[PDB]
Design a protein around this nucleic acid. Structure first.
Lengths: 236, 774, 147, 129, 131
RNA sequence: AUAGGGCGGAGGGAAGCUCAUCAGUGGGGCCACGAGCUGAGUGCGUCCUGUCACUCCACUCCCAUGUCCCUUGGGAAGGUCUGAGA
RNA sequence: GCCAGCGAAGUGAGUUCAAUGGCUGAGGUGAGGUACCCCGCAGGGGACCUCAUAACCCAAUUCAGACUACUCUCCUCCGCCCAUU
């Protein structure tokens, strides 16, 4: 019954990063991972010592729920637009074997097909902001659910913009008609020190996305548990 | 100072939220009448105010400003006429006033309380105190010479199988025994009945020449069976008075009953005493304290000095003997040592300790449910160890209520229970217990405890029950001092959870024998068939589609004939209650593990081995047998009565090894060709106007017992309920030997008692753990 | 002849504690009823206004108790993540956080507030490590035993 | 099966160090040592030493060091014993390759004394038979 | 006849009559064996945090146990210190529990030889010390 | 005669779906003992010497704080009277 | 006609600013259908698919009984009218 395992996209400074850890430790979170933005613009490879959370945090994550220490993981988010950049992921898989759970962000439906079948990742980043044309096809979804591949839905609609509220709820329901809810997680990015929600608050926010009446609670608990369970055998 | 100022707010957050929930429980919508505890609520508080306490009445007098015919008949003669039908015990006016009275095979007795106390009876049994009224257990006194009262009964108890009573020499003076009787020595394995047996002989003669007595404690379904067998085995020979005895017994007092005849050759005097004295089973850890504190021994030194005006001279002649005077002090000293004993779970096996008791309504505390813990003094360590190790009170065991003329004089005085209640209103004692004692009720009683779960090694002392034996005239007068100490009293349903959580079968009819169990199972079949025809269809689940003949527990006239037809083709209703063979059967089903050589431990201190040829020799030695099995569900199960035990397949063991918390497979439905004869019957019934076989009854039970269901069914469950002791579903029922040894031969490997069960209202197989604890 | 209610708890977890001093029942009723009209339309703005009322609020502590029906608890409990920008004289950014959705039954809703309060002061012992504040914790334990 | 055990009787053995007591140790599981340690525990009543006997035990030995100090109470009849309950880290390495794992077993230690605990016990509470 | 065939039931071990009084103002917990370990520490956590709900008030608990039980009764006490995280002083008291065994085969010529046996117990007492 | 279709009245100590997964919720239940308190065996010390060692030999593994079990709105709970829990 | 009570933990639901008859899927029974299978007496059974499963109403200490409000239903007793022989 490992509950409230979500991921954050957060690096600017150690003061803003530790504030999100202490806030997530306050609410319900027992597994908090930090994502890294890697794109085709700068083409940087910082894999070996990106943050070193265990060498900077003061050794005591304490929650007020189960009262257990937090397993802090390191995850990677690769923004892929061109198929020439997708071949970089197949080259760094044997050079540096870190970043236990790998998440990729596709943009083309031809590249989305090889991401669900041929590309060896763990989660799929699906964010549609400010008129991003990307339609969903049913055979690449039906292979990824049998493989065990998950799909992300990263939201932050409540603070920045009101126009961005509509693209997060409309692009979600285009996926709900096809995927049916076999492995769907809903994490949230946080740049400001207060851009996170409560542990039981996600259970209605998944029902706000629709998708279920009871299994939306399992989208933050059960489907998030399968990310570390499937990604552990990929590393070893 | 924000970290300091936040502490004052969070401290008051723990104060205000605690005071908002504590005052509101005492407020109850600002009402005085609902502030009372829920056990102490009466709905007649508005008609008469006298049903309220004194301190709560003063507020209700201020609330009164803001907010059928008479009966003049002799009620004693009314209840005398009503006693001609039933048996009508002395404590019937206590029980019928606050219990659901249901007429049964004998008389009407208390079964369920009017207040909901199902969780309260178990809670008053492992922690608090409890007591019952079990007076239907008859007794048979047998007076005769010592050489004749054993030769006529030696071929009835089967010495080499169960517990003996004849020459065991330890159950004689010290304690009682418990065993199962049978028929004559021709060895039929047909008729059987459990009897808690008592020996006592006089110590100072020490020879087989005096009068030797022994009692047969039995069940009223066996009262027609045992009394006609002992007769066949030994020798083929004004004022308003309270009818303390029976009217059925006194109406048959001249022709037949009580059966008190003598035998010419053997000298065996059969004394039938069905209702001669009453019995109360006192069960609990705190039941050992209220038996000690409320009951006080009779002062033999006060009366016997100079006061001699009135009879009870039978105790005066006892006080005249100086040996009985010093013996009564030893009987009280161990009885006062019982207050040092903390629980009746550690006292070896059914001890007997009788003494003389001055009646405990002399104290009669004013408060109700006045429960007290132990005193903080815990001295006399050497005196407690003397009784725990040896436990030989032969001098102190003096069952003085076994005399005929003395027990008559106990009842002959005919004391009034209401006139003594006026004595506290005449003397007007505010807080003292002052009763004048020139002549009191100095009559003895008997104290016998009973251990629970001796064969089962799970709890070892669950049911710790004392028995207070006493004559017929002292009924409710001895009942009422226990009520004001904190005792919650159950009934027959509480007498049913006494055995099913102790893993022993119930004594009326749940074990299948020939004269007794066939009459109660048919009576059990008449109650639920009336309930089955009471409910209209589309509300109950059908039984042809799901399972087999259920919840009617009589296919074992042909089920035990079928399991012998499966094996032998390639004396009836036998129960293997032989504890020498049950030690072997406990080794096969009980330990189900493998580390080096044996189950759950490598030394074992026993004999581990696989021999299938010796198992087939047991089946040819005892054909058509039936053995009870205690079984334990692992998770996600709830056993009902009359559920079927089914043999698992090879695919059931592979799925549970692959996945933990795996629910069992479902049941494929069966075809019902009997539906076409229903519209044939309904259209013929309406034709003849202008054999009742509707939805699960048919007289064709032969081919279904062979192979009907998907999984092969082998056993039933009689006591099906979820346990408050273990914490899960614990069923209790009966299987056959050939059903076990066919499953046990298939699995010499890992876990063996993992056997699925299927309730008849469902279609879901659920697995339990078979373990025979003998 | 009676209505089945639902009682949901909330907690303001934020820095700059002048926002916690600016709490009122008139502001909170004008905040929740407005943000339902911003997320949902005029349907949920009045379907969650016929039973909605405030009952329990401590500005120094930060626990919010709200009323809602059996048929309309899913609209209030889904509008809780979208509550930002509590506009006042200063610059404030609070955000509510649920603890446990209690189905009616005020008594055990206050019982969960006690066990949440007891777990907060025990963790606060070693993390703060102040001599003047530890004596104030001993004033909280002693007065709680007197209850 | 190679263990690595650290010692976390820490502050209390200060005044015990000035008396040089007789330490009694029970590692995990040894049956004949009960006949060996009680041979010296009976001898320590006869040999000239101070009233200070130090016991220890962890893992499964925490139920055997209680029985070891109980039999000596039937002979010496000590009136004060301090039973302290502290974490004890056991790092064993067993072969499946070599696998290392850290275990936190409970520990127990009984300090039989008679004279030195007269200014003591504000809240220590030794039993007095 | 203690070698070939004999029944050996163990009767009971006296604790005291105190668990009729001990669940009123304090709270007592008898740790058994072969039931569960995760359930027993959860029963220690709820009974320690029950204020005006459990029996009357949460003040202090302490734990009994016999010679097999004290291997795991010490395990629930030390994990409560890291669990409850507060200042909870642990004091233990050892004593002797008598144990009377009865063995009697189903034979006329035999008599039950009652053996003497003792077993070790502990009284791990958990305070509520103000930090 | 065909209780074939339609409708209505009276009566019963009539009855008012169950099961499986999952979730919510109020609770209840969740057993002081391994024939290890001079325990047994092995190799040394030693035949009187054991701050002797090893065997989860009785598996109880695990960052051990319940992924444990059962039950949770009726035949009339509704009124609204009579009677019982002294 | 008149006279008798106990503040003490914890109701196989036990709430008290007043919890709980949930969803999906598979059945039962009551209508309807078959290009499907088996048994061979034109017949019957099984398999599969569609649909009905309600109204009256709500525990507040509990139980027995009377009375009253009822229909997805089953049993008994009949009436009226239509049509048929």
């Amino acid at each position: 019954a490992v509950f409230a395992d979500l991921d954050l996209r957060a690096g600017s400074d150690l003061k803003a990063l530790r504030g999100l850890v202490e806030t997530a430790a306050h609410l319900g979170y027992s597994v908090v991972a930090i994502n890294h933005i890697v794109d085709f613009k700068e083409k940087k490879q910082e894999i070996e010592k990106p943050v070193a959370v265990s060498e900077l945090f003061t050794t005591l994550p304490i929650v007020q729920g189960k009262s257990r220490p937090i397993k802090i993981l390191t995850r990677l988010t690769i923004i892929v637009s061109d198929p020439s950049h997708c071949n970089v992921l197949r080259a760094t898989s044997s050079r540096a074997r870190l970043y236990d759970v790998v998440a990729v962000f596709p943009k083309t439906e031809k590249l989305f097909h090889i991401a669900c079948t041929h590309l060896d990742v763990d989660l799929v980043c699906i964010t549609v902001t400010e008129k991003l044309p990307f339609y969903f096809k049913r055979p690449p979804i039906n292979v990824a659910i049998d493989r065990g591949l998950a799909f992300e839905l990263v939201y932050s609609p409540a603070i920045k913009d009101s126009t961005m509220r509509r693209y997060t709820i409309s692009s979600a329901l285009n996926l709900m008609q096809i995927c049916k809810g076999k492995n769907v997680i809903i994490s949230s990015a946080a740049e400001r020190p207060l851009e996170i929600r409560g542990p039981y608050d996600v259970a209605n926010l998944g029902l706000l996305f629709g998708l279920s009446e009871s299994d939306a609670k399992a989208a933050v608990s059960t489907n998030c548990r399968a990310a570390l369970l499937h990604g552990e055998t990929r590393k070893t | 100072k924000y970290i300091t100022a936040s502490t004052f707010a969070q401290a008051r957050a723990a104060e205000i939220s605690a005071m908002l929930k504590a005052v509101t429980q005492k407020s109850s919508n600002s009402l005085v009448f609902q502030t009372l505890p829920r056990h102490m609520r009466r709905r007649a508080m508005s008609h008469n105010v006298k049903r309220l306490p004194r301190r709560l009445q003063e507020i209700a007098q201020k609330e009164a400003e803001k907010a059928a015919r008479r009966c003049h008949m002799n009620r004693t003669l009314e209840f005398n006429r009503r006693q001609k039908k039933n048996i009508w015990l002395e404590t019937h006016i206590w029980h019928a006033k606050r219990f659901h009275m249901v007429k049964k095979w004998g008389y009407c007795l208390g079964e369920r309380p009017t207040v909901k106390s199902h969780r309260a009876c178990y809670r008053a049994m492992t922690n608090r105190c409890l007591l019952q009224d079990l007076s239907y257990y008859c007794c048979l006194e047998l007076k005769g010479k010592e050489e004749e009262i054993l030769k006529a009964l030696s071929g009835m108890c089967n010495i080499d199988t169960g517990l003996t009573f004849a020459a065991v020499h330890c159950l004689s003076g010290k304690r009682q025994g418990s065993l199962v009787l049978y028929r004559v020595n021709k060895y039929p394995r047909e008729m059987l009945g459990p009897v808690t047996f008592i020996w006592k002989s006089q110590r100072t003669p020490g020879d087989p020449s005096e009068s030797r007595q022994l009692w047969i404690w039995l069940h009223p379904t066996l009262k027609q069976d045992i009394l006609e067998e002992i007769k066949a085995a030994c020798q083929c020979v004004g004022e308003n008075a309270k009818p303390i005895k029976k009217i059925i017994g006194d109406g048959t007092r001249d022709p037949c009953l009580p059966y008190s005849w003598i035998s010419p050759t053997t000298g065996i005097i059969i004394s039938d005493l069905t209702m001669e004295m009453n019995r109360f089973r006192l069960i609990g850890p705190l039941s050992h304290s209220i038996l000690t504190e409320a009951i006080k021994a009779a002062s033999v030194h006060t009366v016997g000095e100079d006061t001699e005006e009135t009879p009870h001279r039978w105790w005066i002649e006892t006080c005249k003997k100086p040996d009985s005077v010093s013996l009564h002090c030893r009987q009280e000293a161990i009885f006062e040592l019982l207050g040092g004993i903390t629980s009746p779970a550690e006292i070896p096996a059914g001890t007997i300790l009788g003494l003389t008791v001055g009646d405990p309504r002399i104290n009669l505390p004013q408060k109700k449910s006045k429960a007290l813990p132990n005193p903080e003094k815990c001295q006399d360590n050497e005196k407690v160890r003397q009784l725990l190790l040896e436990g030989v009170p032969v001098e102190c065991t003096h069952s003085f209520i076994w005399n005929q003329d003395i027990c008559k004089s106990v009842t002959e005085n005919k004391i009034s229970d209401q006139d003594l209640n006026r004595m506290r209103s005449e003397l007007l004692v505010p807080g003292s217990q002052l009763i004048l004692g020139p002549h009191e009720s100095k009559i003895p009683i008997l104290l016998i405890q009973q251990p629970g779960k001796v064969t089962g090694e799970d709890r070892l002392g669950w049911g710790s029950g004392w028995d207070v034996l006493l004559p017929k005239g002292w009924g409710m007068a001895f009942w009422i001092p226990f009520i004001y100490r904190g005792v919650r009293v159950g009934g027959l349903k509480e007498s049913a959870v006494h055995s099913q959580y102790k893993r022993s079968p119930n004594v009326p009819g749940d074990f299948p024998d020939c004269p007794a169990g066939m009459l109660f199972a048919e009576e059990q079949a008449k109650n639920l068939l009336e309930k089955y025809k009471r409910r209209p269809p589309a509300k109950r689940p059908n039984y042809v589609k799901l399972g087999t003949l259920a919840p009617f527990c009589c296919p074992w006239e042909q089920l035990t004939q079928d399991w012998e037809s499966r094996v032998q083709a390639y004396s009836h209703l036998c129960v293997l209650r032989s504890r020498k063979l049950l030690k072997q059967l406990s080794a096969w089903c009980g330990p189900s593990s493998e580390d080096s050589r044996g189950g759950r431990r490598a030394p074992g201190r026993g004999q581990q081995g696989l021999t299938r040829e010796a198992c087939l020799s047991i089946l040819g030695h005892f054909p058509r047998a039936l053995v009870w099995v205690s079984l334990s569900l692992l998770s996600k199960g709830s056993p009902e009565p009359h559920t079927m035990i089914c043999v698992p397949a090879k695919e059931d063991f592979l799925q549970l090894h692959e996945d933990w918390h795996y629910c069992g497979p479902q049941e494929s439905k069966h075809s019902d060709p009997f539906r076409s004869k229903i519209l044939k019957q309904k259209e013929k019934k309406k034709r003849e106007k202008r054999e009742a076989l509707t939805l699960g009854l048919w007289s064709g039970p032969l081919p279904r017992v062979t192979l009907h269901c998907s999984r092969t069914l082998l056993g039933f469950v009689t006591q099906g309920d979820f346990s408050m002791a273990v914490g899960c579903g614990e069923a209790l029922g009966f299987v056959s030997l050939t059903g076990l040894l066919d499953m046990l031969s298939s699995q010499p490997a890992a876990q063996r008692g993992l056997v699925l069960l299927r309730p008849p209202a469902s279609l879901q197989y659920r697995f339990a753990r078979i373990a025979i604890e003998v | 002849v009676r209505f089945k209610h639902r009682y949901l708890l909330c907690e303001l977890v934020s820095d700059d504690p002048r926002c916690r001093l600016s709490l009122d029942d008139r502001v909170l009723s004008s905040l929740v009823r407005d943000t339902i009209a911003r997320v949902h339309g005029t349907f949920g703005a009045a379907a969650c206004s016929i039973g909605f009322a405030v009952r329990y609020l401590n500005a120094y502590t930060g626990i919010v108790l709200l009323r809602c029906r059996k048929e309309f608890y899913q609209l209030v409990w889904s509008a809780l993540p979208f509550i930002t920008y509590l506009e006042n004289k200063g610059h404030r950014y609070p955000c509510f956080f649920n603890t446990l959705h209690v189905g009616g039954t005020i008594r055990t809703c206050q019982k969960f507030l006690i066990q949440y309060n007891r777990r907060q002061l025990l963790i606060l012992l070693q993390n703060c490590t102040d001599e003047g504040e530890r004596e104030a914790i001993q004033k909280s334990v002693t007065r709680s035993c007197l209850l | 099966m190679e263990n690595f055990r650290k010692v976390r009787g820490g502050p209390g053995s200060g005044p015990f160090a000035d008396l040089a007591p007789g330490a009694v140790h029970m590692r995990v599981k040894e049956g004949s040592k009960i006949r060996n340690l009680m041979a010296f525990a009976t001898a320590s009543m006869a040999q000239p030493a101070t009233r200070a006997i130090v016991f220890s035990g962890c893992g499964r030995a925490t139920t055997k060091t209680v029985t070891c100090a109980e039999i000596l109470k039937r002979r010496l009849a000590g009136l004060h014993q301090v039973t302290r309950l502290r974490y004890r880290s056991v790092r064993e390495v067993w072969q499946s390759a070599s696998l290392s794992v850290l275990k936190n077993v409970p520990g127990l230690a009984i300090l039989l004394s008679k004279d030195a605990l007269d200014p003591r016990q504000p809240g220590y509470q030794p039993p007095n038979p | 006849g203690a070698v070939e065939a004999e029944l050996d039931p163990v009767e009971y071990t006296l604790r005291k009559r105190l668990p009729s009084r001990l669940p009123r103002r304090p709270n007592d917990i008898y740790v058994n064996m072969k039931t569960d370990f995760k359930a027993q520490l959860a029963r220690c956590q709820k009974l320690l945090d029950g204020g005006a709900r459990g029996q009357n008030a949460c003040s202090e608990i302490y734990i009994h146990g016999l010679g097999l039980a004290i291997n795991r009764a010490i395990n629930i006490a030390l994990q409560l210190q890291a669990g409850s995280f507060g200042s909870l002083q642990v004091a233990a008291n050892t004593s002797t529990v008598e144990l009377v065994d009865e063995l009697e085969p189903e034979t006329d010529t035999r008599e039950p030889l009652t053996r003497i046996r003792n077993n070790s117990a502990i009284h791990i007492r958990v305070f509520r010390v103000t930090p």
